[PDB]
Each structure stands twice: as C-alpha cells, then as structure tokens.
Chains A and B, each alone.
Chain A
Amino acid sequence: SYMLPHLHNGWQVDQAILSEEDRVVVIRFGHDWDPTCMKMDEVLYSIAEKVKNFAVIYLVDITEVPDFNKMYELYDPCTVMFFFRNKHIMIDLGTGNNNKINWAMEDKQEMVDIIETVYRGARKGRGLVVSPKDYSTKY
C-alpha cells in the first residue's frame, strides 16, 4: 500500500488527471478502513510497476475529499475510475453499470488485461470498450 501514493486534496486529483497525457490515470475512490477497499489496494499495488509505462495509479479517500461524491455519484466502499486526456472512460464488465468499476477483481492477470484493453481501445478515442471477461454473475 505504501508503494502507491495518495491524493490529499481534490486539487491534487484534478491536476493529476490533467498532467498525465500519455497514460491512463487510474483512481481508487474509497476509505482506508474498508474490507474491500484494502483488498483492491493490494491487487493494484502489485500491478502498478508492471504497468508503469501505460498506466498511472493513485489513491483517494471519500472522507478526505468528498467534493467528488455527487458529480460522479459514489456509493459503496470503492470505485475504480479511469481517465485518459480528461475524458472519463467507460467499460462494460457485464455488470450493468458501465461507469467506473465496483467489484473486486480476482487475479492479477485479469486485472492487467482490463487496463490494457481500456488503454488500447481508449487510444483510438473509443468511449466504450469491452472487458473480455464479463463478471455480471460475480457482482
């Protein structure tokens, strides 16, 4: 967890989305105490190095910055939200909400595919992508 940095103001969130031109900006929105927001914080931290060349990761806490709760509508322990060139990206995991991510993904590998898929599709301006594995059943 101490690998991955944290964002302590909503102004750290916004500049961080802007200044990274060439890579995804992946953010976990959720709060330290949570059962499920700790688990994801692991599965990302392990992956963050492998992917440094196309994706950048950060951590944010709903309690630290609540400014973003209404606009993106944040419910539940945590939401993974992908950004490329200020454009909110979007993917269908078969789960019935195409915005963000909720459920906890299981393998390191299946997580890297999703990041890679989003980036590759995203690079072409495509706003939707399809997660190869569709965990509607899972979540």
Chain B
Amino acid sequence: KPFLGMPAPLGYVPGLGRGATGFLDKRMDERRKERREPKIQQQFSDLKRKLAEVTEEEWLSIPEVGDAR
C-alpha cells in the first residue's frame, strides 16, 4: 500500500488521468427569517468510564495472542 501513504496530487482531476470512460442574498435571508419566526454507545459508554481506572503498567502486561480453538 505504498501510494496510500504519500498524500499529494498534481492539481489533477481524477477522471482524465486514468483515461476515464463513463460506461440580494441578505434580502433573501430576511425573507426566510420572516417565515421561521447512539444506543450501543449508551449501553457501553457507561462501561468505558469504568475503564478509566486501569494503570499503564497493566495496559502493557496484557497477554497478546491467544488462540483457543
């Protein structure tokens, strides 16, 4: 994934380079005004606060790759 890393274009359109084929304002605002006039996180979030306590040494010494089947 080397390209994934790089980040810069030429000031270039995407379609062309590959060779691509397709198969007053204030007044208005005033007028508008004259008219004007999740669950999962909730379930868990509560646990996540619970975590805060844990020490940085323990965060390290966590067993890493256990297969049980």
Residues on A facing B (Cβ under 8 Å): 5, 7, 9-19, 65, 67-68, 70-73, 86, 88, 99
Contacts and interface: CB of A to CB of B under 8 A. Distances in A.
Contacts, number: 41
B19 A71 contact: no
B23 A99 contact: yes
Main secondary structure of the interface of A (DSSP, over half): helix
B9 to A, nearest CB: 4
A72 B18 contact: no
Interface in B11-35: 12-15, 17-23
Contacts of A17: 18
A5 B3 CA distance: 12
B23 A19 contact: no
B39 interface: no
